[PDB]
RNA sequence: GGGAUUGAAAAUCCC
RNA sequence: UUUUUU
RNA sequence: GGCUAAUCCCCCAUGUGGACCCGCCCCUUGGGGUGUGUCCAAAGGGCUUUGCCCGCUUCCGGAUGGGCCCGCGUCCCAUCAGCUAGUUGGUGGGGUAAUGGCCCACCAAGGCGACGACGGGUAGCCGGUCUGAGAGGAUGGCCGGCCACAGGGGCACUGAGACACGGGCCCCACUCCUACGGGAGGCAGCAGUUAGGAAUCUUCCGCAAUGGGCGCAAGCCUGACGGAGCGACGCCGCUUGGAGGAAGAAGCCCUUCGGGGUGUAAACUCCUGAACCCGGGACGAAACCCCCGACGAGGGGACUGACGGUACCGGGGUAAUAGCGCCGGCCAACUCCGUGCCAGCAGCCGCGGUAAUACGGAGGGCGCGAGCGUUACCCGGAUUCACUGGGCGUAAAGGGCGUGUAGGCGGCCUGGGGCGUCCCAUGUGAAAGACCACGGCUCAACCGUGGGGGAGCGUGGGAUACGCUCAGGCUAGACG
C-alpha cells in the first residue's frame, strides 16, 4: 500500500483552488460590466470590461483557460457590452473597443 | 405485349430449329437485327433478311443444320445445339472485360452488348471492353 | 469530396428546413438484380427558398442540428409533384395493416 | 422463387437441433446415479440392458447406458456421461464412460481396452 | 520412428518383389522365390476381385513401403507436389528420390534403403563437406554427397564400394569410388525410374 | 514523440529486428509508421543490415528520435556521414 | 425356478 | 398371438 | 498557531508577435491579410564561470497522436406494427478545443416506420481463420488494429490529454480492523489460492538484449519484455538397430492329418553406436560512456549475460521403450473355440433364440505409429434454402375466387442527357498472414529478405449497345 502518487492528489486540490478563484473573478466581473451597459453607464462599463479582459488572458497564462477558451469569453463579453450600450450609445471611454 | 423480345427471338429460333423449319420470322427491331448479324457472322444461321408480313416488319431467319444421318433417327445434327438467354429483365447480368466467360472451352460464343456495340466474347475481349451478357450460343 | 446527393423535397412543414428524399440504385450483393432504395435527408434551407416538389442537389455540410448534416446546394428541376405523390401514397398505405 | 421474391424474402438457413443436450455443449458431463435398471429393448431384439438415471452438473436428469459385460455401478455412485445413442432403447441418448470415477473398467477384457476403460496386462 | 519389423514379408503382400532387404532380395531367398502369395493363414486362398478402393490402396502402400516412410512424411510430401508447377505424379517421385537416405542407397554407399537410413543417422555422410544426419534432407541438384573420411576406413564402406567397382549408376547420378564422393546431377524423370508402381493410381487415391 | 527504433520479428533464440518509425507510445511489436530497414544481430546472412539512408534522413529532419541502439546501426549505414 | 411344447420364445399343460 | 420367408 | 526557500503563486514593465470587438480587402460556412482601439509574455540552474550545456517565454510552421461529422456495409424473431415530449425544427443563450437539442429559456408542430421504425433475443467488430471446386457456410482464441469495461451504479478534480485498473468523492453488495463513535480494501496486472468445471501452467531466472518513464549524465524503475519450468495440447524433426541367417527350430494357431500359418521374424555371426561419461565451449554485444576531433562528421578505445557451461564441436561408447483402433456391407483385413433372444455389439442398415467371418477370447490380418481411439462442436459430402444450383397434376408444395394499392416488370423509331453498365489513369486497400522466388537454423516445423495479386470505395478523363431518364414520333399490345 501507500504509493506516493498520493502526493499528486494533494497538488490536485491546491490547483483546484487556484483555477476556481480566477474563474470566480471572471464571472463576477463580466456580469458587473454588462449590468452597466444594460444600465447605460458607458465609462464605468468599459473601465471594468478591460479588467475582465486582463483577468481572462491572465487565467489563460496557466492551466485554467489555456486554449482559445479564454478568447471565447473575451469574444462573448465584448459583443454584449457594445450591443447593450446601443441603448443610448455614447461610448465614452472607448478604451477596449475599436473606432 | 412481349415481355422480353430477345429471349422471344432466341426461342423462336430455338423452337424453329427443332422441327427443322427452313426459315422463321421474328418481329423486327434493330437490336434483334444486331444479334442475328453476329449469328450469321458465326455460321449459326444461313443468314437473315427483312420482310413485311401484312404491313409490319419482320426478320426471316434462315437456319442451317448438319447432314442427314445414318440408321434410326436420320434427322440431322443441329448447328445450334444450345441457346439460352442470360441477362433477363428483372435480373440483369453485366460483366467487366475480365468477367467475360469462355463458352464451351472456346467452341461456343457468348454474345455481349458493349458500349462499343454488340460483340462476341472474343471480339469484346480483344476490344478490351465488357457489358451486358445477352446469351450463350454453341 | 463532401458527399453530394440529388433528391426531391417531400416535406415543407419545418422552419428553415426541408426533407429531401434521395433514391439509390445498386445491384444486389447475391441475387444481382438492380434494387432501388431510398433515404430521407434533413437539409438546411436558410432562406426558405426551396418548396415542395423541387428536385435539389444536397451537399455534405458541417452539422446544423441533430439529424441535419446536409445543406441545399442548388435547384435541379422545379416542381414535379409526382415524386411526392408516390411517397405520400406510400405513407398513406401504412394506415391499413394494423388491426 | 423469382429473383424479385428472393430479394424480398431470401432463403432461410436450417437450424440444426442438437441431439445431445449435455449442456454448455460440453464433451462430457459428470453426474450422480439415481437408479441402476435393466430395460426391455425395442422390437426386433430382446435382452436385459443395464442403464442408469443420472442427475447432472448441468441440472439435467437423463438415462445413460452402461457398456461392458458387468458393472460395479451402485445407487449412489458418481459417473461420467459420454453421449451416443443406444439404437434399440428409446430415450437413451448418452453412454457412460467406463474407467471413470466410480465405474470401474471391465475385468479381463483383452481386445478393445480404450473403450470400456481397462489397463494393459502383463505376460510372463 | 519408421516401420521396424519383418520386411521380406511385405515383399509378399504387395505381390511385387520389394528390395528393402538389400541383398538376399537378389539371392534365391527373397521369399518372393517359391512364396509369391501374401502372408497370413489365408495367403494361400484364392483372393476376391479387389474393390476399386482396394487397388488404389495397395498401390500407395507399394510406393510408401519401398522408400521406408511413415504416412505423415509421405502425405505431406504429396500435398507439396499438387501445389507445385508440373505434373503432380512425376514431381512426387523426384521429391522422394531427393531424400538423402534414398540418395545414399541409390549411390551404392549402402546395400538397402534401411541400411542407408542408419548411415545418415550416425553421421557417416558428408553433404558438400558438411555432415548431415537427417535422412529427410532434400538433396538439391549440384550437392556433393561424400563419405566422412572418419569412417572411410570402416570396413562396411570399403565392402560396398568394392562391389561398386564396375557398377553403373543412375543417369541423374555419378560417383567417384576411391575418394567415396558422389554428386546429384539433376532430378530423375518418369522414364528414369524403374519403380513397379502406377502413380496415377496414387494421385487418384488422395482424391478421396 | 515519434521515434526510430527496433521491432523484434524473429523467433525464439532467432531474433530479427525491423528498423521502424513509430510513436514511442505504441507497443514495440505494434503498428508502425514506416519500415526503414532490417537488422540481423547474429549476422547469419551476408546482408544483415540495410537502411535506405535517404529515407531515414527524412524522419530526422522532422524530429524522430532513434534509440541508443537504432542510432548505432544508422551510423553504420552512414546516415550522418556529411563529407 | 426344471420337463411337454416349438427353429426358439410367448401362451398352454406336468413335478 | 411374437421374431426369422429361408 | 508560527518561521522559510524555490524552475511554487502574483503585480508593473518591454509587444517580435498573438488574443478580442469594429471597419475594409481577398477568400468563400468560423480560411488569409490589414488598420485603430484594449488585453497578454517569462525561471532559473550547471559547470571546463566571459562562454557553452539542460532548461524558460510569445508566435508561425512541421511531424505524430487524437476529437467530432458524413456515404456505404454489419445476426435471429412480424407470434414485436405502429414508436416519439428534448421528441423534430427555429431564434437566442449556456458549454467544450470544436459542430450539435449536448443542456437551457421562448416560438413553430413536427420527426421516424413494411426499403422493418418501436420492442424482444443474441452478440465486442475487423485483419483474418477453418472449410469448400467455387459461389458460400462457419468463425473472431493466440498475433496485429479499433472499441468497451476495471465488484455494481453515479460524479467530478487535476491536466496537453482521463471522467482515469493499481487517482479522488458518494450510494449499494461483500470481506477485514473496531475502544461500536468510526475506519481500510477491490489480481478482468505477473505468479498463486479457492469455487465452479469434462478441462487450462511456475507463488521460476534476469535488466544481458529490445522497448518504455524520469535524468545533462552516472544511473534508477520496468511480472512490457527476453528466457527457463510444467502439459503429447498442436506442428515438425528423430530413436526403439543395420547386413548375413532354415524349402525353414520350439511355443502358440489352423488342418483334408499329407501339411499349412506366425516367418528372415527369433536364436546365432558380423559392423555401426540413441542414451551416458570426459574435455573444449558460443553467436546473440555494441552502443549509452571515456579519450582525440568543437560535446558535430569521422576515428580510436573500454565495460557490458538471464538463457548457461545450454547450443555446438571433438573423444569415448552400450543392440538399446511399442502401442492403439479395426477385420458383416459402406471399408483394407478370417479362421477356431466359447456362448444360445442369454451375456453383449451397434455411426446407419443390422448381428445374437446351437456350425455367429458382427457378441467374447485366441491365432492371423489390415491401418496408423509416440501415438491411437473416443465424445462434443464447425464446414464437407448437402444441387437438402438450389446466386452459380431445386422444386409445386398423382411424391412436401398453386392462395377458394375476384377487384385492385404499393412494389416488380415494359412493343417499335429518333434525339438530348450519361444515373446503372463498361474502359484508361490515379489514390487507397497498414504489418503479419495466404501465394511464387531465394536465403538463415545440419533438414523440416519456425524465422528472414525480395516479388506479385486483390474485390471494394475516392478522384480525373472516356465510350453510349443495353437498363434508366426527359423531349418527340408510330400502330403490331391494350382500350374504344
Ligand atoms: Mg512525484
Ligand atoms: Mg459573486
Ligand atoms: Mg481543464
Ligand atoms: Mg446467371
Ligand atoms: Mg487492348
Ligand atoms: Mg417551410
Ligand atoms: Mg450554399
Ligand atoms: Mg385500426
Ligand atoms: Mg432479410
Ligand atoms: Mg438450447
Ligand atoms: Mg444451453
Ligand atoms: Mg438411434
Ligand atoms: Mg501440380
Ligand atoms: Mg499460373
Ligand atoms: Mg537427370
Ligand atoms: Mg511471443
Ligand atoms: Mg497510442
Ligand atoms: Mg552491411
Ligand atoms: Mg545528415
Ligand atoms: Mg498557518
Ligand atoms: Mg505589430
Ligand atoms: Mg503587461
Ligand atoms: Mg511559472
Ligand atoms: Mg491529422
Ligand atoms: Mg441467432
Ligand atoms: Mg422516452
Ligand atoms: Mg405529450
Ligand atoms: Mg423527458
Ligand atoms: Mg417518458
Ligand atoms: Mg449555438
Ligand atoms: Mg477538457
Ligand atoms: Mg457555439
Ligand atoms: Mg430506408
Ligand atoms: Mg437488448
Ligand atoms: Mg445477455
Ligand atoms: Mg455479450
Ligand atoms: Mg483452399
Ligand atoms: Mg461475423
Ligand atoms: Mg464502477
Ligand atoms: Mg443509471
Ligand atoms: Mg501534464
Ligand atoms: Mg462525455
Ligand atoms: Mg475510461
Ligand atoms: Mg489491482
Ligand atoms: Mg492509475
Ligand atoms: Mg480511501
Ligand atoms: Mg472442483
Ligand atoms: Mg533499454
Ligand atoms: Mg557529467
Ligand atoms: Mg521495485
Ligand atoms: Mg514471456
Ligand atoms: Mg512425429
Ligand atoms: Mg533383420
Ligand atoms: Mg563396438
Ligand atoms: Mg561481438
Ligand atoms: Mg577536448
Ligand atoms: Mg563515433
Ligand atoms: Mg548499461
Ligand atoms: Mg559426440
Ligand atoms: Mg535388439
Ligand atoms: Mg471388405
Ligand atoms: Mg466391437
Ligand atoms: Mg457350442
Ligand atoms: Mg459355435
Ligand atoms: Mg469376432
Ligand atoms: Mg486426436
Ligand atoms: Mg455434418
Ligand atoms: Mg450448399
Ligand atoms: Mg456444393
Ligand atoms: Mg435457383
Ligand atoms: Mg427438389
Ligand atoms: Mg384453383
Ligand atoms: Mg387483374
Ligand atoms: Mg403501378
Ligand atoms: Mg424499352
Ligand atoms: Mg420503370
Ligand atoms: Mg441516345
Ligand atoms: Mg457514368
Ligand atoms: Mg484501382
Ligand atoms: Mg498484406
Ligand atoms: Mg536451407
Ligand atoms: Mg512478405
Ligand atoms: Mg468516374
Ligand atoms: Mg410517348
Ligand atoms: Zn525381399
How far is the centre of ligand 9, averaged over its atoms, from the C-alpha of C7 (Å)?
Answer: 26
- Which of helix, strand or coil describes residue E197? coil
- Residue B2 cell numbers, joined: 412481349
Task: Tell me the pairing of strands B94-95 and B23-27.
Answer: unpaired
Do residues A42 and A90 lie in contact, with contact meaning Cβ atoms separated by under 8 Å?
yes
Between chain C and chain D, the number of residue pairs with CB atoms below 8 A apart is: 9
Do residues C45 and C15 lie in contact, with contact meaning Cβ atoms separated by under 8 Å?
no
How far is the centre of ligand 11, averaged over its atoms, from the C-alpha of D24 (Å)?
Answer: 6
Domain hosting A48: range is 1-99
- Which of helix, strand or coil describes residue E119? helix
Do residues E60 and E208 lie in contact, with contact meaning Cβ atoms separated by under 8 Å?
no
Cβ-Cβ contacts under 8 Å for E85 (sequence gap 6 or more): none
- Give the annotated binding-site residues of E for Zn(2+): 8, 11, 25, 30
CATH class of the B81-138 domain in this structure = alpha beta
- Is chain D in touch with chain C: ≥3 Cβ pairs within 8 A? yes
How many domains, in total, are found in chain A? 1
- E120 CA → I314 C1’, Å: 19
**Distances B20 to B66, B69, B81, D77 between C-alpha atoms, Å:** 11, 14, 13, 84
DSSP symbol at A99: -
DSSP symbol at E170: -
CA distance B77 to chain C (A): 36
Domain borders along chain B are 3-80, 81-138
- The answer to whether F55 CB is within 7 Å of strand I is no
Question: E10: phi > 0 → left, psi -120 to 50 → alpha, else beta; which?
Answer: alpha
Tell whether B92 is within 8 A of chain C (Cβ): yes
Identify the residue whose cell numbers are 451486358: B132
Round to whole Å and give the CA distance between F83 and F75: 14
**Long-range own/partner contacts, residues E187-191 (CB < 8 A, 24 or more apart):** E187/E94, E187/E97, E187/E98, E187/E141, E188/E93, E188/E94, E188/E97, E189/E90, E189/E94, E190/E89, E190/E90, E190/E93
- Way the structure was solved: X-ray
Round to whole Å and give the CA distance between D82 and D64: 9
- D65 CA → I362 C1’, Å: 29
- The answer to whether A29 CB is within 7 Å of strand I is no
Element (H, E) at C92: helix C81-93
- Suggest the residue from B88, B91, B95, B133 to mutate for an interface test with chain C (most C CBs closer than 10 A): B91
Round to whole Å and give the CA distance between D97 and D84: 11
Give bridge partners of residue E1 from the DSSP assignment. Answer: none
Round to whole Å and give the CA distance between F33 and E31: 71
Element (H, E) at A81: helix A69-84
Q: Going edge to edge, which strands form the sheet with B56-63?
A: B23-27, B56-63, B45-53
Measured between CA atoms, the residue of chain C closest to residue B88 is: C33
This PDB structure is determined at a resolution in Å of 3.4
Name the nt closest to F8 by C-alpha to C1'. Answer: I210
Domain borders along chain E are 1-96+194-208, 97-193
Q: What is the CA radius of gyration of chain D?
A: 20
On whether the D1-124 domain is CATH 2.40.50.140, my answer is yes
Short-list A79, A42, A74, CA closest to A58: A74
Nucleotides of I under 7 A from a protein CB: 9-12, 18-22, 29, 35-42, 58, 62-65, 68-73, 77, 81-82, 88-91, 93-102, 107-115, 136-138, 143-146, 157-161, 164, 166-168, 184-185, 196-199, 209-213, 224-228, 236-248, 253-254, 260-265, 271-274, 283-288, 296-298, 313-315, 319, 321-326, 330-335, 341-352, 360-370, 372-379, 384-387, 390-391, 405-414, 419-424, 430-431, 435-437, 439-444, 446-450, 458-459, 462-467, 476-477
- The answer to whether C93 CB is within 7 Å of strand I is yes
Round to whole Å and give the CA distance between B12 and F2: 73
D residues 4-23 closer than 8 Å to B (CB): 4
Amino acid at each position: 500500500r501507500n504509493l506516493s502518487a498520493l502526493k499528486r492528489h494533494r497538488q490536485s486540490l491546491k490547483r483546484r483552488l487556484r483555477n476556481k478563484a480566477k474563474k470566480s473573478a471572471i464571472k463576477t466581473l463580466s456580469k458587473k460590466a454588462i449590468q452597466l451597459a444594460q444600465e447605460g453607464k458607458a465609462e464605468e462599463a468599459l473601465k471594468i470590461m478591460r479588467k475582465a479582459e486582463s483577468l481572462i488572458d491572465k487565467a489563460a497564462k496557466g492551466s485554467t483557460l489555456h486554449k482559445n477558451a479564454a478568447a471565447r469569453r473575451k469574444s462573448r463579453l465584448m459583443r454584449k457590452v457594445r450591443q447593450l450600450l446601443e441603448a443610448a450609445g455614447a461610448p465614452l471611454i472607448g478604451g477596449g473597443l475599436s473606432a | 405485349m412481349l415481355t422480353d423480345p430477345i429471349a422471344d427471338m432466341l426461342t423462336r429460333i430455338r423452337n424453329a430449329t427443332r422441327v427443322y423449319k427452313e426459315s422463321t420470322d421474328v418481329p423486327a427491331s434493330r437490336f434483334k437485327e444486331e444479334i442475328l448479324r453476329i449469328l450469321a457472322r458465326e455460321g449459326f444461321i444461313k443468314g437473315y433478311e427483312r420482310v413485311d408480313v401484312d404491313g409490319k416488319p419482320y426478320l426471316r431467319v434462315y437456319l442451317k443444320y448438319g447432314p442427314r444421318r445414318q440408321g434410326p433417327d436420320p434427322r440431322p445434327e443441329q448447328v445450334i445445339h444450345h441457346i439460352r438467354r442470360i441477362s433477363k429483365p428483372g435480373r440483369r447480368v453485366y460483366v467487366g472485360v475480365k468477367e467475360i466467360p469462355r463458352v464451351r472451352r472456346g467452341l461456343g460464343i457468348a454474345i455481349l452488348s458493349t458500349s462499343k456495340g454488340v460483340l462476341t466474347d472474343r471480339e469484346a475481349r480483344k476490344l478490351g471492353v465488357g457489358g451486358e451478357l445477352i446469351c450463350e450460343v454453341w | 469530396p463532401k458527399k453530394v446527393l440529388t433528391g426531391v423535397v417531400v416535406s415543407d412543414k419545418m422552419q428553415k428546413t426541408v426533407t429531401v428524399l434521395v433514391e439509390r440504385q445498386f445491384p444486389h450483393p447475391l441475387y444481382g438484380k438492380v434494387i432501388k432504395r431510398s433515404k430521407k435527408y434533413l437539409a438546411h434551407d436558410p432562406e426558405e427558398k426551396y418548396k415542395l416538389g423541387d428536385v435539389v442537389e444536397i451537399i455534405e455540410s458541417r452539422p446544423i442540428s441533430k439529424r441535419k448534416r446536409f445543406r441545399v446546394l442548388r435547384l435541379v428541376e422545379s416542381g414535379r409533384m409526382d415524386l411526392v405523390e408516390k411517397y405520400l401514397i406510400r405513407r398513406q398505405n401504412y394506415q391499413s395493416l394494423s388491426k | 422463387p423469382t429473383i424479385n421474391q428472393l430479394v424480398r424474402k431470401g432463403r432461410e438457413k436450417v437450424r440444426k437441433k442438437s441431439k445431445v443436450p449435455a449442456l454448455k455443449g460440453a464433451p462430457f458431463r459428470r453426474g450422480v446415479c439415481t437408479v441402476v435398471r435393466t430395460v426391455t429393448p425395442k422390437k426386433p431384439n430382446s435382452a436385459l440392458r443395464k442403464v442408469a438415471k443420472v442427475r447432472l452438473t448441468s441440472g439435467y436428469e437423463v438415462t445413460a447406458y452402461i457398456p461392458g459385460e458387468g458393472h460395479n455401478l451402485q445407487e449412489h455412485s458418481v459417473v461420467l456421461i459420454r453421449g451416443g445413442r443406444v439404437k434399440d432403447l428409446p430415450g437413451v441418448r448418452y453412454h457412460i464412460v467406463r474407467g471413470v470415477y466410480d465405474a470401474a473398467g471391465v475385468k479381463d477384457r483383452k481386445k478393445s481396452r480404450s473403450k470400456y476403460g481397462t489397463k494393459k496386462p502383463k505376460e510372463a | 520412428g519408421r516401420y521396424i519389423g519383418p520386411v521380406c514379408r511385405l515383399c509378399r503382400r504387395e505381390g511385387v518383389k520389394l528390395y528393402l532387404k538389400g541383398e538376399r532380395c537378389y539371392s534365391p531367398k527373397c521369399a518372393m522365390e517359391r512364396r509369391p502369395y501374401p502372408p497370413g493363414q489365408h495367403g494361400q486362398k484364392r483372393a476376391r476381385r479387389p474393390s476399386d478402393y482396394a487397388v488404389r490402396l495397395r498401390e500407395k502402400q507399394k510406393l510408401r513401403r519401398i522408400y521406408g516412410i511413415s504416412e505423415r512424411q509421405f502425405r505431406n510430401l504429396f500435398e507439396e507436389a499438387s501445389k507445385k508447377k508440373g505434373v503432380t505424379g512425376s514431381v512426387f517421385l523426384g521429391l522422394l528420390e531427393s531424400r538423402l537416405d534414398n540418395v545414399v542407397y541409390r549411390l551404392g554407399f549402402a546395400v538397402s534403403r534401411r541400411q542407408a537410413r542408419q548411415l545418415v543417422r550416425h553421421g557417416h555422410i558428408t553433404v558438400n563437406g558438411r555432415r548431415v544426419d537427417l535422412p529427410s534432407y532434400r538433396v538439391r541438384p549440384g550437392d556433393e554427397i561424400a563419405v566422412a573420411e572418419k569412417s572411410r576406413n570402416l570396413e562396411l564402406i570399403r565392402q560396398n564400394l568394392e562391389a561398386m567397382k564396375g557398377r553403373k549408376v543412375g543417369p541423374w547420378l555419378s560417383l567417384d569410388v576411391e575418394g567415396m564422393k558422389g554428386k546429384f546431377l539433376r532430378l530423375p524423370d518418369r522414364e528414369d525410374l524403374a519403380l513397379p508402381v502406377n502413380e496415377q493410381l496414387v494421385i487418384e487415391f488422395y482424391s478421396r | 514523440m515519434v521515434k526510430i527504433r527496433l521491432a523484434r520479428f524473429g523467433s525464439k533464440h532467432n531474433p530479427h529486428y525491423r528498423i521502424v518509425v513509430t510513436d514511442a507510445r505504441r507497443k514495440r511489436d505494434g503498428k508502425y509508421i514506416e519500415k526503414i530497414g532490417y537488422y540481423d544481430p547474429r549476422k547469419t546472412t551476408p546482408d544483415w543490415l540495410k537502411v535506405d539512408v535517404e529515407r531515414a534522413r527524412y524522419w530526422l529532419s522532422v524530429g524522430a528520435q532513434p534509440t541508443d541502439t537504432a542510432r548505432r546501426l544508422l551510423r553504420q549505414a552512414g546516415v550522418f556521414r556529411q563529407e
